[PDB]
Amino acid sequence: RRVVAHMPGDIIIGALFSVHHQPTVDKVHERKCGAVREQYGIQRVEAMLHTLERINSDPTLLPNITLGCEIRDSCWHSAVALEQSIEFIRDSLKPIVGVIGPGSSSVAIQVQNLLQLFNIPQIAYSATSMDLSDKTLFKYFMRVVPSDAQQARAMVDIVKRYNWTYVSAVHTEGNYGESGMEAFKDMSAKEGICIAHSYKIYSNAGEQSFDKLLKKLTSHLPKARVVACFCEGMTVRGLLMAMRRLGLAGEFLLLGSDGWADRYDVTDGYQREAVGGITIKLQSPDVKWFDDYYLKLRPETNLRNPWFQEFWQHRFQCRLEGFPQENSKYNKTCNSSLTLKTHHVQDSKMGFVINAIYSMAYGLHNMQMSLCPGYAGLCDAMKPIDGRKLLESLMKTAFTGVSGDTILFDENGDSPGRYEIMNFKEMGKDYFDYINVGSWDNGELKMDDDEVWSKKSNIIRSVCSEPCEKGQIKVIRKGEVSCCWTCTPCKENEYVFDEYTCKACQLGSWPTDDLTGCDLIPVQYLRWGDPEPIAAVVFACLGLLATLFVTVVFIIYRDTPVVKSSSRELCYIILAGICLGYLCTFCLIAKPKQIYCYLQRIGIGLSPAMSYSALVTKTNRIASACAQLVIAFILICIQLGIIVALFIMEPPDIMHDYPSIREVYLICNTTNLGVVAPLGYNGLLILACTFYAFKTRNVPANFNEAKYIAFAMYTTCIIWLAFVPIYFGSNYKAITMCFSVSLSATVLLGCMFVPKVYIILA
Amino acid sequence: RRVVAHMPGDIIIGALFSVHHQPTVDKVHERKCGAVREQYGIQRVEAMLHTLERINSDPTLLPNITLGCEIRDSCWHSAVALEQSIEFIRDSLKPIVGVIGPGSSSVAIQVQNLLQLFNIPQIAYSATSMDLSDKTLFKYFMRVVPSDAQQARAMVDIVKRYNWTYVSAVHTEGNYGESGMEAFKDMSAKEGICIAHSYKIYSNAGEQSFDKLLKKLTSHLPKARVVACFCEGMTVRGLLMAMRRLGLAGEFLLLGSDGWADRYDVTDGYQREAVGGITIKLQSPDVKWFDDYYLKLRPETNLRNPWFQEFWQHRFQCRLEGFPQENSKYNKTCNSSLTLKTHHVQDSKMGFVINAIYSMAYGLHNMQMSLCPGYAGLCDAMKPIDGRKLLESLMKTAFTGVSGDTILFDENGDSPGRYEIMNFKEMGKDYFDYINVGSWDNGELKMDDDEVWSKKSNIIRSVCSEPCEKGQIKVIRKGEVSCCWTCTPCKENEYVFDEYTCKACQLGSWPTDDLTGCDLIPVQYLRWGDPEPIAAVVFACLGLLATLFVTVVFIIYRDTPVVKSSSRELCYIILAGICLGYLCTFCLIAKPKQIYCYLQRIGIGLSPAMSYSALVTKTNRIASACAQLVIAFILICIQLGIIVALFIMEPPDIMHDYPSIREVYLICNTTNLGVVAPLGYNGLLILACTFYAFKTRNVPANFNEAKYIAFAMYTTCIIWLAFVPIYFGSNYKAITMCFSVSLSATVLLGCMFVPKVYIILA
């Protein structure tokens, strides 16, 4: 059947080493595992077979007693290792104190499920899965290697450090790859990372299965250029084989895991397809004394290792004619000159196997010391070794590993460990070698980006969408994933509220530079320096000059008999009204203020009433005594009363009008009704003036001035009728107001004031 | 050691029935399972014993050979079942020829991983997970129940049938619940479903874990009203207990699975919490002969079943004083009047257990018939029973099961089956019972939508966001599952093109009522039917009538002595200028086209030159068949040359101008130059000719017309200076041009022709 190593002794420690390769996908039911392995097989077998002798020669460990082993073979298969463990326990149905757990995590789970039935403590050296840390189900399981939650954290840190966002994930079926990828998915998709799609594949699947997997991987080729591989060594070897077969020169950047580590048997003959890969390897410096013992081994003298002969044939293809394992398949015959020195690699996880066996030895030594402190041997109270006591002792056995540091088992039976971020690279032509470019110990990732990517043209950033943080362009995501977005800009009215939202601020406002925030529009008023305002104010100035000139001339010629027909105050109140009109034009052009707008309203109400009440008195009186001032002031006072009514109704306040979202101006609260009320008032005044104008328009005067009053009436009537479209049609509004009122003030002067003075001076 | 229920026979068939409960959390390491179970325990053990007795009593099935059994207790735990299986195969280290596998999928997997190493076919009556369908790892595993892929499909179909989207998910940790929820997640998020969060919990977890899980479930309570539970029975019982404790009486609609089924253990004493829950049960009719056998059992006689005394005491709390297993913990004593009839409920999976036993018996019978057809009974070639031959025989056996149908296994070792959609409801007063509301069969889901929710008010559909495609409101996804969209509308300018992008009508289009497709807003014309157009046309018509009357008067009085100072033609030329100006006014408002705006522009350009040139010529002459005609002609030639040069530089066409995106107007070709070149030319003319008219003032003429002319041309200059900013300021152009040109021509309709009509009239 399956041969087994032997080493008789007082206490027997079983072991489970993957001596042969996993059974091929066809021979699974026969459980006929395949070709031999050096590193995971013979090297570990000889490591145990020599560390037991190193312990035995040591009197400080297990004095006066002999430690023995029964090394079995697990073929990296749960089904095979279960049956080998059954062979372990058949004696309990020499007893076995414990085993050194199998390398595979799923195999370790399968073995533990049976070992805990017989209180047989199991120590593992590579079973890195998290699921084994649950002491409720796996009480008798311990390991000198940290869980792979730390490994998932390390990979998340790696992809963080390289801007990688849209990665792809492959993991082998089982419990190591499955739980590792679950943890990585958690701590990545939580923070910022994005897995394009998660894939699974058995290690021993056929070539076509890897072909299909690589087709699915190349489906996302342009963007997901990074593959996060929680994959055992053989899975990555299969992936490289598929990469070669279907013609890929290494478009991807494989991101390996503890399975890949820095093994040379996963990238032998397929180096060109793996250049640039980044792997994670547990730090374990090579054990010197094992190398010095192993390199001298020869197939003739080594007889306690039944798998050494077939391995020796397999390594140097040859035939051992003088030994029973002929294996005539190899044509040639090897001389007594082939040595293991040439192309010798000691695996990474050798310090772990040695440390695990040393942990078992120290647990047994502490048990012996505690149970029988006096007796320096096999005390009669410890001959039936109780499993539970040994496990309890093992849980707290701190010692010094062959590496040099101290080995402790925490509450979950793990042990602290660092990491060494390897990086496959092509140092020389036809020459590739794993190179160390980093570290990771308790959340810290030190990794120089110079040995890796000795340039700035690194791998294409595995990013779904390029950043678009340039002003208006935001990001939107339809239904695919939170990582791929189609950038779109929103209107200039709005600014980016967040990454995924841009909202416009209120009517009077504007987004800031680069749309970072929003700012109020700088409001502007009717500027003092501008062609139309300057023209208006100069017009007001010249009109004022003329008006006070007329008042002065009137005052100096106060009692001239020809003008002793109308009231002296009448052609003084008309001057006053024209003066308030000019003051209204002057005060219209200004920053709109409460007092200022009140001034505008009161002037617009009062000035037209003042001057034209004189006309009303004239046309009525020509048709008595001196009460014409009274009959004008009654109309003026009712005008003041109504204007106070609207003024109380519409108190003066300033609002920033919004003709458009771009522009804002500041005005006061004169509304359409509030401006049409005095406009209608003046229209009624003009209607009454016309209703009294006919006879005055026809009856001449001494200086035929009634005719000039008539044309002044017609001109002011037409300028008043045509005014409405200019003010309402145009958005300037204030300019129309000032120009119209100023012109209406001028026209009455130009027909009556000049002729009287002109004749008087002549 | 645990007790077993032996039975004589040359062929021995093992069994694993969960007689006792799962070991408690604090007692796992000691593997001491809890209380006894009736339905999943003693009922199944009695079923197996009686059915083996029936087979041994049947001569047509396995003649001349007696079937035995070695029933063992699995306590529903993986660890206990493993030591039971090791005890099964202890002889192989009378051999067992095949076990009737345990119920739980994880337990079945753990037992199978050990049994298949010894070629022992295992038939499971209730293992349902999809992992067991893989024949590369589970070669020696068959079942008489369909996998849970169909169950996940039925769950998804049920969820789809009630528009549940934002459902919550909980699954018992293990291999049944875990794989079930994996299938559900995959092939529900495939079609349309959503998952708020997926939780997991061991079925034996303490009250604290259940309390935390229920709090986490309430964390989505407002929207996640449906809980998808791929949960074992005890997990649902724990959830119901938690709901009872932390006051949740009817805030969830549990969607159970086969684990819940129609069990009364899960909802015993907790009916009020579980009302309305929907569970999926594997259809299996009751077996009446089993009921007849079982209801007659008494602890006095039943000595071949070691657990019957403990179960009898636990069912009717008592102590059997006449038996070794008194267990005086219970106070009272069992009188000889208690019978199993009262409250007896057969377990749902009773057809499947008997079917599994019959399947193993029929496989053994087929293998015996094939091995030794001549011999009727045991043969020498069969005495070392080979597991491979038995498995081959079982894989292709067909027989009539107790339900009356035919039992067969496919290439994966499963067996077809159909489900029933049970629903828990309050039948009456404090009387709760599992009711049947439909079945599922190979994608065919049938229900009774009136039996469950006998009203239009069903459960609040677990929807994260209400339908947001209302009118114009958009759909936007946030940083979570694309399931809870936020309702935002986009402006009336744009329309909802896609639920995640609503694009805008480009410049002159409008969205329809559905906001799916821009409507290309129709343009508006000059609005011939409107009061302002009516006034314009009436004014133009009256001016035309007056001009034609004046022309008729002139033609009749061709050479009257009064009109002799003025040139005969010259007055006719200004008449022509006026009537063509009125014609251009009348045509100014219509639908712009090459047949209209052509003559529009030529008329407006040419009118102000011909009339005004004739007028200035009249002034010059007063200042016969001479240079007057040629100077008017050359002035017209140069003005028309300017017009034609403009037309060459601005061909006639209509542009649909866009003052705002809201509205669109149409206007024929027009530029600033096209409206200022005639403006500038004519303005130079008015300046020069107004200087001329002021020079004329009052001079002897034909009845002193010079004063009339000077006054009218003063009005002409003032109106020309007046409304130019009106056109430059106001938005309206056509109507204002109409009115202005019409009344400005009216100004020159009087001065030339009021004296003529007055002279004729007088």
Ligand SMILES: O=C(Nc1cc(-c2ccccc2)nn1-c1ccccc1)c1ccc([N+](=O)[O-])cc1
């Ligand atoms: O209505 C006349 N033509 C005209 C056109 C325009 C104009 C203004 C702004 C933009 C574009 C075009 N303005 N405008 C005008 C001319 C004079 C007075 C008022 C308006 C007119 C009236 C009388 C005589 N005539 O008596 O010779 C000549 C011409």
Ligand SMILES: *[C@@H]1O[C@H](CO)[C@@H](O)[C@H](O)[C@H]1NC(C)=O
């Ligand atoms: C990308 O990562 C590198 C670190 O090597 C650094 O430039 C920075 O953290 C990231 N750059 C951007 C633009 O995110």
Ligand SMILES: *[C@@H]1O[C@H](CO)[C@@H](O)[C@H](O)[C@H]1NC(C)=O
């Ligand atoms: C579920 O939605 C469909 C359409 O989505 C509708 O016809 C039906 O009335 C809704 N309700 C039920 C109970 O099916």
Ligand SMILES: N[C@@H](Cn1oc(=O)[nH]c1=O)C(=O)O
């Ligand atoms: N670390 C893996 C085992 N393993 O697989 C390999 O290919 N190398 C290796 O160490 C596990 O934890 O299961």
Ligand SMILES: N[C@@H](Cn1oc(=O)[nH]c1=O)C(=O)O
């Ligand atoms: N399909 C279930 C079967 N089952 O689970 C229970 O808890 N009861 C029961 O019948 C499983 O795989 O365990």
